[PDB]
């Protein structure tokens, strides 16, 4: 764990580092050939992790030739973390994209494929095309999976060495593959490795979201229903190797373990992080709070320090905006209605004494360049020239160093959110890539978040410090108490979710079972041995209902057995005539003649239709019957789950009773499945030109 | 002499004069150009007409912009600027330089020293434009002001005292309103409303026409109201209702009704008391944008070739609209609308189009009405093997990167309710951008990037430029027009095509399911196709009937608003008269007479016999409302000889007498400012009372009832009637307040 894994990994980095001279003296085509060489050793039984030093040095050198970018040491480490069942926490702007090229390469080598999982189709395409040169230079192929892509193009994307696509599309492909009627219709290979780009949304927020295929035609208006379902959690759990990335904003390590058996490793930043996060400040009232904020801004901007003020609503942004104006402090508000205005304001938000106010600041952030962006500047030029640019960079170097000397970007949170990951994202907007920076959050006793101390009195004691319009002290214990209360809400919320997951696990295990069976059936061209085997189960169970085993003859319902056979097995047998003609029948030889009779009737149909046609008919029938009963069972399981309000109550766990019910329903479906297959095959009409 | 054609003919002659002035302006020093302003002002002071100044003043602005901004206005921008000097909307297409154009009218409309208000849609543009233009105009010897929310009143007065002011509609209006709550003239922050130049009139003037600006404060009557009214409630055995309800008390029952448009606040008290089972602010002041902008002596504004709404500007604001030509010929090819049986036939036709165009290297932008519709067309493009990108509103950084390459050869981009104006699509891609990954550029580097871009640029132009596919039209044609106008900007080749199907929602605008359902019979066979120009015109005419219909409905609302406006214009006119004078005594003396005459009329009927006089009603009336206890009867026992009119005189007289005493104790200046104060305050009170009671009458325009005996109109008459009653209660209450005012006399 911990530094032990990290210290061990650091030893590998020194080896990778020491290999670079050897790597720089190789030709491009020799570099290409290391992939062939890695695979030949793998073929001779080599352990993949033994190849990490050489494999990562090859990628680092290919990247410099191809991208003009050389993986940093910390990116080597992150690449190592992602080859295990691990989340790498890497800070924003640390290079997650390039880092991911490392484990992707390594885990492509055994020829089983790589699924790099993106949040949207834009990224899937962008990263596939950007990386295709790197990976072709190394003798690998790259695939792109999209919604709407024809099955042959998808098959091709999945046959590549490394594939890019969204989570949704991967999951939907799995479901549709589990509705195929021949193994050639499948688009995916075995699920080998999932490298997931942004695990907060993809693995945590979406864990229980069902992916569903829906079903126009059905059964006996005729509206549409669920044919196939899997949660995201249980899709990613089918993979042999699972890993992913997120930012240091974190707070959910214990969820990743609980939901996925994923460890999380915090990866060190390339440069030392020096952002000063100062103690949280508490004020009696919003008004005192806001005045404090105005005062901080006032002092900092006078120093030349840029500020970013994050609020929780439009109304509060307007309030702090109006008060800054009332104090004569120039600023800009990020207004969600004016996207162009916003990008233009962002661009210069790190300019000396810039003040920017943002409402529920969100996505990774567009970066804030200190001193300003100088590129927005040349971008704005219409015929930019050499001496023009260096003038521009020259004045910028000075603005940059000046903003740094002044303490870099100061972040002010005017309120904390209930989720600390949100606060962490705002504050992470400062101190990127080793830059000086600072952060401070403000609270009042009127703030909504004071309600997470589930007690007025407890909360309202804080006012006994008294605060007083200027003489503010600072108590560190408040920062920590607040962080503890956000942590408790998360814990509470998750405890509730994990009880929901334990229900989800009943469906999961059932789905895993039935899909395993289906796939066994799918992979086999001839299903005879099962048919024969299940025909005997079905005949025995059917017969038992009328001939209680080893009972006297007077308990037998030969009338009911005759019709049963007729109506379900198309089998019309003079059973009463047999008994009354052979005293020497006996039960067990009755069962045999019945079984034998259905079988020779089936053989006659087969002779008319043909063996191969028959084999394939059996297999189709088995798949189609599986599918029909499984859609039925999914709806029944659905109704049983929401019925969780009048069944298990006064000291019998409702969970334990649901599990009994669910197990009973599954076990019954599996018996129905055999019944219906044999009944279909029994009753299939065939024109006999004769007897 | 026709209309717009003739306008542009005459403006073009002026443009040729302005261009001829340019070498003269060139040769002038910077200080000489700065002096032009003072020289134009000396001319105006000696009686010159402003419009005689247009050519000189424009040559001056245009040469100042060269030297300062390094940009020289185009001839089309001179035209746009002359338009904006008139009560007109200059319609100039996206990309044409509205922001620079607007410096010309602003400069000219500043020369008379009365101020300009540039109106922006937000604070960011206000500020940016202010700062960007300060150097231009300070070069021309003028000053520039910025007005923002929260700005302190001194700062605000300075911004309005600048030559040219920038700010949002909202803040202009709110300043106005608060100026009308001032108790002294020096509290006002604005000057008289001279010229407003509105930057984007579609949102500011149309969409936002009826949006009220409201100042509220508890600034109210207290209670006792609620709780007297409470005390009926513990006998409401809920079994007719009105007579029951009426059942005595105060301020009603002399056989006066409860739902008189007059006892409206009272009735609201009971509607609230009894609806109550299942402080408050109040409006201190309100105005609409439409009625704010109508206060200005000159109004003008800009928008892009985004018309369709000309008839509403003229109807609502009396703004004419001039369509300004483009600096370069606008060659976008806007092709016949196509109509398909089914959504599915339509999409298939779209695909084939994108497919043939991208094979010849032309870029396509595909605009849809929803996310669902975007996913559909995208998936079908993927099914056809066609690469593209969707603009996903969740991924704003993705979207910016998509757009930057959206004019790239064979690029295909799908947009969901794409907005107006928006971020441009550069053909070939963006070449001063491309460098914006490039951390240390050189001689060779950009040169390269730029030449390479040229080849891409020229190849896209030769392929037809950007093609726009509208997959469905909107009900608003303005929107469709904003989408097609993404293409063919600044003289570039481009084209547009809109697609429609019988299954499309928009087919509903043809008020007959069967009349719509005819086209079916011109039955659109799959891969084949024809084009009929009458369909295109029919669709456009349908959209225009839908618009004109919604605007008939709006007009009716605006009739309601005309009542309010007329009442507020009149009371605020009375309020400002008062505010602007130190001494309101003549006003006061005049209205006490009026008040005293009429009060006496009510008991002594003019010319009456001394037995048609009621003094058991007259003297009480006096001691009650005026603190003026005159035992008149007991005079009248002594002088039977005196006569009605010289008794009215002696009545009057007294009140003056007792009031001059109150004054020689308080001080004349004190008394004078207390009187203006009483008059302002009383009018403020009654006004706010009126605003509330009308709000309540208006929401009687619901189920008090009636698509039947004309609700509106009855409303206008009850409202004007109550307004004219309020002006008389203002007079009576002022005089009551000043007659009852307590000030401690002498001693003993
Ligand atoms: N090793 C490197 N050498 C040079 N530039 C790098 C390196 N690693 C990443 N970058 C650049 O750093 C920036 C941030 O990387 P990105 O993957 O977009 O960041 P994040 O971790 O926030 O997703 C990008 O512009 C990327 O190309
Ligand atoms: N006369 C000119 N010469 C050179 N560039 C100009 C001129 N007028 C405007 N532009 C530029 O044209 C671009 C678009 O102008 P803007 O005022 O934003 O256009 P729009 O009419 O669509 O609002 C801006 O970058 C602007 O600075």
Swiss-Prot record, chain A:
Reactions listed under catalytic activity: ATP + H2O + cellular proteinSide 1 = ADP + phosphate + cellular proteinSide 2
Membrane topology: Peripheral membrane protein
Regulation: The translocation ATPase activity is stimulated by SecY and a precursor protein such as proOmpA.
Region forming the signal peptide: none
PROSITE patterns referenced in this protein's UniProt entry, alphabetically: SECA, SECA_MOTOR_DEAD
Main subcellular location: membrane
Inducing factors: Repressed under conditions of excess protein secretion capacity and derepressed when protein secretion becomes limiting. This is regulated by SecM.
Record field: transmembrane: none
Cofactor note: Binds 1 zinc ion per subunit. Zinc is required for binding of the SecB chaperone to the extreme C-terminus of SecA.
Localization in the cell: Cell inner membrane; Cytoplasm
Phenotype when the gene is knocked out: Essential. Leads to loss of translocation of lipoproteins Lpp and BRP.
CDD domains: DEXDc_SecA, SF2_C_secA
Residues in coiled coil: none
Keywords: ATP-binding, Cell inner membrane, Cell membrane, Cytoplasm, Membrane, Metal-binding, Nucleotide-binding, Protein transport, Translocase, Translocation, Transport, Zinc
Record-listed ATP binding positions: 75, 93-97, 367
Cofactor: Zn(2+)
GO CC list: cell envelope Sec protein transport complex; cytoplasm; cytoplasmic side of plasma membrane; plasma membrane
Entry's Gene Ontology BP terms: chaperone-mediated protein folding; intracellular protein transmembrane transport; protein import; protein secretion; protein targeting; protein targeting to membrane; protein transport; protein transport by the Sec complex
Family membership: Belongs to the SecA family.
Subunit structure: Monomer and homodimer; probably dimeric in the cytoplasm. It is not yet clear whether the form that functions in protein insertion is monomeric or dimeric. Part of the essential protein translocation apparatus which comprises SecA, SecYEG and auxiliary proteins SecDF-YajC and YidC. Makes direct contact with SecY.
HAMAP family, sorted: SecA (MF_01382)
Role description: Required for protein export, interacts with the SecYEG preprotein conducting channel. SecA has a central role in coupling the hydrolysis of ATP to the transfer of proteins into and across the cell membrane, serving both as a receptor for the preprotein-SecB complex and as an ATP-driven molecular motor driving the stepwise translocation of polypeptide chains across the membrane.
Protein's name according to its UniProt entry: Protein translocase subunit SecA
Annotated source species: Escherichia coli (strain K12)
